[PDB]
Design a protein around this ligand. Structure first.
Ligand SMILES: [Mg+2]
Ligand SMILES: [Mg+2]
Ligand SMILES: [Mg+2]
Ligand SMILES: [Mg+2]
Lengths: 64, 127, 67, 73, 62, 279, 139
């Protein structure tokens, strides 16, 4: 039974570690989502400023 | 110049109520003696000034963290023409609590569906 | 019990080991992708800061030009 | 037949045991990989924040530049 | 006790189902980051050009 | 330097038992008054310390001859992963019996089949840190805003605090300066865990002009409802810190706008608080 | 220090620029040497009292029995004090070398270790007793 119990302990530890892995996976995924939303925001603003600076550069070189 | 404000905004369609979360604020100007102010944020629906919500008073920090939440039981149809007001106040025990800043958010510019959470620069309240 | 019980035990255990291994590989790939994307973000922030400098100097120049 | 059977059973026991040990090792590697992954996420997150502040600054500066060009025209 | 074995198995399966989705979302993040990289390069290029033009204009109207 | 020990070892396959014979010892150092000690040998199976066997006490000899025999009823399969321990003790009537020497014999190095009997030199018995626990967290400081982000990640191999079970750990974080405890933070209480996972972030307002004069104190404690809550371990980083702690601190400083995660070994609260009372 | 015999020879040579302890005049300095371990003060030695001096010269040798197995776990505490007959005798300064020592002190110690059967002379800056004793209460 020592063979079996030893293994039992192993499976229990694996269980705990798996639970922790679950929590970590949840935090991971959530923060990944939020960061994705933030990146979307960044690309919106970056395109806005791209247009801004293109138009501004054209207007600036226009008076030359 | 006072500082910025991080807040959260989203709408619960299951209970038909607005969920406004006050996360924190940063780089607030100091108005008190110690070199730091005692800030607290008053939040209320912009359209009608009724049932205004106030956060807990934080002592002597120019970067207060409230992490609080408020619920406005308002239908989704009325919501569109309703604005949100978040004003930062400075607490003083022996005088009028001076307003540090304020911020207004139109609910027609707000997009619900994804949980919103952003930093916005504070401005000086109108006389 | 019998040999059937032990065999099924062994089988389900191996199944668990393989599922575990797939989980592992997923985590490894995760770390990898996140790292590479990290380098990507490095160069992005680089380009952005350069852009900020250029814009600032440009704004100063125009601001001195108009007046 | 019988001896080989008992030995077979004990064999399967040992195999399952070392298998579970392998599992423990694997979930440990997974654990650490996950941790460093989260660390990377924090770092890159702050970097993204700095990027956002950069974008805001760019926007305001170009707004001013737009003002000056409109005041010059 | 097969209950613990199968329960742990279910845990593992769940975490797997989490992680594969997380991985796909990460790939999407890689796409968004790549496009942001290109956009940033173009942005700083235009920034340098506008800086040059601004230098000319300052050396013109002052 | 104490002396040598002659012993015998063999296995009886007919009764499935281990036959350990204590022959004698030689050149033992004298610890008693007369110029000779009163030696006696304690022998037990190394794997499990159960049913230890002790020889008769010999009076005033530095070359005691026991010629005794002990039997360990242990199967031959279990024997392979079992070690033998033979420790020489000095008898004293009015005090603790000091250990003269000890010797350990791995049963995988032992060859049975021929009756073994050898002389082996005695060595001094081993007396390490008691806690053997570790706490891992990440440090991030950006000098411009003066923000200190301490993220408690996870502890492992913590010392048992509850009776017949695992512990109920929680992390308390103190920020000290000139011996005073300024800020107080704590985490969620994870119950019945050998390795608690928190992943909880804390932030502190620390100016750039005082960064070299601050103390960050991380303490892992156990939680019982009733009575005083004891403490498992604690470590500190920052001002007047040494070891891997000062290293992690210097990594936090050298790497701004970036969090560095690291492990740390838990020390006793007495020594740590003694270090914090300095300057 | 010679490791074989386990002899530690501390020769107090001379102090300089000591802080004034007497009213409207120079000080009356004398050197007290303590040998500490685990916070306990084992041996106590002192020197002759040189009266009215800005820079006291002693040239006095002291010896201590220190085994080679405990050389890395010993504390040598040198204290310069002022002597008045009446009342408590105050303290001017003190420094310590050995276990848990830092600076030029640990350097001098390491020079003593690296150079056996040979005496190495060195200067040391006097610290306040509070900080030093706070350092000695460690471990
Ligand atoms: Mg006030
Ligand atoms: Mg005796
Ligand atoms: Mg408990
Ligand atoms: Mg005097």
């Amino acid at each position: 039974m020592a063979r079996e119990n030893e293994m039992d302990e192993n499976l229990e530890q694996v269980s705990g570690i798996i639970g922790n892995l679950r929590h970590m996976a949840l935090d991971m995924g959530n923060e990944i989502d939020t960061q994705n939303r933030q990146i979307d925001r960044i690309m919106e603003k970056a395109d806005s400023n791209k247009t801004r600076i293109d138009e501004a550069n054209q207007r600036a070189t226009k008076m030359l | 110049k006072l500082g910025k404000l991080q807040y959260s905004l989203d709408y619960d369609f299951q209970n038909n109520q607005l969920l406004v979360g006050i996360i924190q604020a940063a780089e607030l100007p100091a108005l008190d003696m110690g070199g730091t102010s005692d800030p607290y944020v008053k939040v209320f629906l912009l359209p009608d000034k009724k049932k205004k919500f106030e956060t807990k008073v934080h002592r002597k920090t120019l970067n207060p963290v409230f992490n609080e939440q408020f619920t406005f039981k308002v239908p989704y149809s009325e919501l569109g023409g309703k604005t949100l007001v978040m004003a930062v106040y400075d607490f003083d025990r022996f005088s009028k609590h001076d307003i540090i800043g304020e911020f207004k958010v139109p609910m027609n510019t707000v997009d619900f569906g994804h949980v919103t959470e952003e930093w916005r620069d504070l401005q000086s309240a109108e006389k | 019990m019998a040999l059937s019980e032990i065999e099924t035990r062994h089988s389900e255990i191996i199944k668990l080991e393989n599922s575990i291994r797939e989980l592992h590989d997923m985590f490894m790939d995760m770390a990898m992708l996140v790292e590479s994307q990290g380098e990507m973000i490095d160069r992005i922030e680089y380009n952005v800061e350069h852009a900020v400098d250029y814009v600032e100097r440009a704004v100063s120049d125009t601001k001195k030009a108009v007046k | 037949e019988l001896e080989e059977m008992q030995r077979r059973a004990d064999q399967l026991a040992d195999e399952s045991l070392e298998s579970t040990r392998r599992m423990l090792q694997l979930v440990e590697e997974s654990k650490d990989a996950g941790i460093r992954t989260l660390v990377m996420l924090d770092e890159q997150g702050e970097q993204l924040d700095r990027v956002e502040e950069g974008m805001n600054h760019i926007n305001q500066d170009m707004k001013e530049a737009e003002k000056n060009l409109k005041d010059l025209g | 006790s097969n209950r613990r074995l199968q329960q742990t198995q279910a845990q593992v399966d769940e975490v797997v189902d989490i992680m594969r989705v997380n991985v796909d979302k990460v790939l999407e993040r890689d796409q968004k980051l790549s496009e942001l990289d290109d956009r940033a390069d173009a942005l700083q290029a235009g920034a340098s050009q506008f800086e040059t033009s601004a230098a000319k204009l300052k050396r013109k109207y002052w | 330097k104490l002396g040598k020990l002659q012993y015998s070892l063999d296995y009886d396959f007919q009764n499935n038992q281990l036959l350990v014979g204590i022959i004698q010892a030689a050149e033992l150092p004298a610890l008693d008054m007369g110029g000779t000690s009163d030696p006696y040998v304690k022998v037990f199976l190394l794997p499990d310390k159960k049913k230890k066997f002790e020889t008769k006490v010999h009076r005033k000899t530095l070359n005691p001859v026991f010629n005794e025999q002990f039997t360990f009823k242990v199967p031959y399969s279990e024997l392979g992963g079992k070690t033998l321990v033979m420790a020489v003790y000095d008898f004293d009537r009015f005090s603790k019996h000091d250990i003269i020497g000890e010797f350990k014999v791995p049963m995988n190095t032992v060859d049975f089949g021929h009756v073994t009997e050898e002389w082996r030199d005695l060595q001094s018995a081993e007396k390490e840190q008691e806690k053997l626990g570790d706490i891992c967290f990440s440090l991030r400081y950006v000098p411009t805003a003066g923000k200190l982000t301490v993220v408690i990640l996870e502890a492992k191999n913590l010392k048992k605090m509850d009776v017949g079970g695992l512990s109920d750990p929680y992390v308390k974080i103190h920020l000290m300066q000139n011996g005073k405890r300024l800020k107080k933070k704590k985490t969620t209480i994870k119950k019945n865990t050998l390795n608690p996972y928190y992943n909880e972030s804390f932030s502190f307002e620390v100016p750039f002009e005082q960064i070299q004069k601050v103390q960050v104190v991380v303490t892992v404690l156990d939680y019982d409802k009733i009575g005083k809550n004891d403490a498992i371990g604690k470590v500190f980083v920052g001002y007047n810190s040494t070891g891997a702690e000062l290293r992690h601190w210097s990594d936090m400083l050298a790497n701004p706008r970036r969090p560095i995660a690291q492990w740390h070994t838990l020390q006793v609260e007495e020594e740590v608080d003694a270090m914090l009372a300095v300057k």
